[PDB]
Design an enzyme around this catalytic site. Structure first.
Site, mmCIF file in Angstrom:
data_model
loop_
_atom_site.group_PDB
_atom_site.id
_atom_site.type_symbol
_atom_site.label_atom_id
_atom_site.label_comp_id
_atom_site.label_asym_id
_atom_site.label_seq_id
_atom_site.Cartn_x
_atom_site.Cartn_y
_atom_site.Cartn_z
ATOM 1 N N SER A 195 0.780 -1.238 0.000
ATOM 2 C CA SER A 195 0.000 0.000 0.000
ATOM 3 C C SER A 195 0.815 1.294 0.000
ATOM 4 C CB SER A 195 -0.952 0.025 1.205
ATOM 5 O OG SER A 195 -1.976 -0.948 1.095
ATOM 6 N N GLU A 242 -4.057 -6.889 -5.908
ATOM 7 C CA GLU A 242 -3.217 -8.008 -6.376
ATOM 8 C C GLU A 242 -1.733 -7.700 -6.228
ATOM 9 O OE1 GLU A 242 -6.728 -8.150 -6.958
ATOM 10 O OE2 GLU A 242 -5.923 -6.843 -8.544
HETATM 11 C C1 LIG Z 1 -1.698 -2.140 1.707
HETATM 12 O O1 LIG Z 1 -0.570 -2.461 2.083
HETATM 13 C C2 LIG Z 1 -2.794 -2.964 1.934
HETATM 14 C C3 LIG Z 1 -2.678 -4.121 2.701
HETATM 15 N N1 LIG Z 1 -3.637 -4.908 3.194
HETATM 16 C C4 LIG Z 1 -5.061 -4.697 2.874
HETATM 17 C C5 LIG Z 1 -5.303 -5.212 1.449
HETATM 18 O O2 LIG Z 1 -4.650 -6.154 0.994
HETATM 19 O O3 LIG Z 1 -6.095 -4.617 0.721
HETATM 20 C C6 LIG Z 1 -5.996 -5.231 3.974
HETATM 21 C C7 LIG Z 1 -7.460 -4.868 3.684
HETATM 22 C C8 LIG Z 1 -5.621 -4.654 5.348
HETATM 23 N N2 LIG Z 1 -5.596 -3.185 5.458
HETATM 24 C C9 LIG Z 1 -6.631 -2.381 5.689
HETATM 25 C C10 LIG Z 1 -6.104 -1.162 5.775
HETATM 26 N N3 LIG Z 1 -4.785 -1.255 5.607
HETATM 27 N N4 LIG Z 1 -4.463 -2.431 5.425
HETATM 28 S S1 LIG Z 1 -5.858 -7.059 4.082
HETATM 29 O O4 LIG Z 1 -4.419 -7.290 4.453
HETATM 30 O O5 LIG Z 1 -6.677 -7.367 5.304
#
Ligand SMILES: *C(=O)/C=C/N[C@@H](C(=O)O)[C@](C)(Cn1ccnn1)[SH](=O)=O
Ligand SMILES: OC[C@H]1O[C@H](O[C@H]2[C@H](O)[C@@H](O)[C@H](OCCCCCCC3CCCCC3)O[C@@H]2CO)[C@H](O)[C@@H](O)[C@@H]1O
Length: 265
Positions: A45, A143
């Site tokens: 992210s 992805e």
């Molecule tokens: C960015 O690094 C996102 C990581 N994890 C997300 C995703 O894969 O979309 C989730 C939704 C966790 N998340 C929420 C907010 N920040 N991270 S997944 O890992 O649960």
């Protein structure tokens, strides 16, 4: 806590994974700490900050407006859309989309924005245009954090990411207003910002964007410093560790503690 470099090593030993880190003066680019700084790590992210830098560049050029309202459909939503799922009836402005992508890590907001800059290829071209010949985006929001071993897709290096963030925030490539906006979005992170402040000693500034992925991938791009000043850019990425999220968080916090206790270097 021990010296920053000793703590970074202890973290690899405890996690059985690779840690990549850069500590850099924001105003000058002076590199203070560099560990596996030229090695690749999944951006996860954290790519959302570079994404909005590209959006702001378009705004500066007159090719985009942060006010422009984008109307999207439920079919356009992807996994984890805390803000965007609430605006199927009224849409969101480009600026609101950047705030949602950065401060809430809203994935649909990120994908809508990614399309406006030409998709993963377009963002990668933007990175090349600002002098980053290493960072690359290849996939869309839900992805890109798969973190397969040996997979160069969606990766950056600590050195590249630190340099790129510095360019976006301070090099005048973006207008004064855009530089200020990108910084404020990082200051406003809701995912990790408040939590980090809760454990930082009084007087320490924090702005950030965090990320997580498969195979233990975890990371943070941040601005940190005493006297309530964004004195340094700190980029830390972790990869290939089977550790729990709690322990990956703890190890990154531990490196931060070493920095805080031994700041004057
Ligand atoms: C960015 O690094 C996102 C990581 N994890 C997300 C995703 O894969 O979309 C989730 C939704 C966790 N998340 C929420 C907010 N920040 N991270 S997944 O890992 O649960
Ligand atoms: O002597 C320095 C300080 O030592 C302790 O502070 C601790 C603090 O109590 C703890 O909660 C934190 O954990 C570190 C939390 C770091 C959180 C994330 C940091 C990010 C920021 C930038 C990118 C990488 C990590 O460490 C500091 C330093 O030991 C004392 O509590 C504090 O009174 C004192 O001023």
């Amino acid at each position: 806590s021990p010296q920053p470099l000793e703590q970074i090593k202890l973290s690899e030993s405890q996690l059985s994974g690779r840690v990549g880190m850069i500590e850099m003066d924001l105003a000058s680019g002076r590199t203070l700490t560099a560990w596996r700084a030229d090695e690749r790590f999944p951006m996860m992210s954290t790519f959302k900050v570079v994404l909005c830098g590209a959006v702001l560049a378009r705004v500066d050029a007159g090719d985009e407006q942060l006010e422009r309202k984008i109307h999207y459909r439920q079919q356009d939503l992807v996994d984890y859309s805390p803000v965007s799922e609430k605006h199927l009836a009224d849409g969101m402005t480009v600026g609101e989309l950047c705030a949602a992508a950065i401060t809430m890590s809203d994935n649909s907001a990120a994908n809508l924005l990614l399309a406006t800059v030409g998709g993963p290829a377009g963002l990668t071209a933007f990175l090349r245009q600002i002098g980053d010949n290493v960072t690359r985006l290849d996939r869309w929001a839900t992805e890109l954090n798969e973190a397969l071993p040996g997979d160069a897709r969606d990766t950056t290096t600590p050195a590249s990411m630190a340099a790129t963030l510095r360019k976006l925030l301070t090099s005048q490539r973006l207008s004064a207003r855009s530089q200020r906006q990108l910084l404020q979005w990082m200051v406003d992170d809701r995912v990790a910002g408040p939590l980090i402040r809760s454990v930082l000693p009084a007087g320490w500034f924090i702005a950030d964007k965090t990320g997580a992925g498969e195979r233990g991938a975890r990371g943070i791009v941040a601005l940190l410093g005493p006297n309530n000043k964004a004195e340094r850019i700190v980029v830390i990425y972790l990869r290939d560790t089977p550790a729990s999220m709690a322990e990956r968080n703890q190890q990154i916090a531990g490196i931060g503690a070493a920095l805080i206790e031994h700041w004057q270097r």
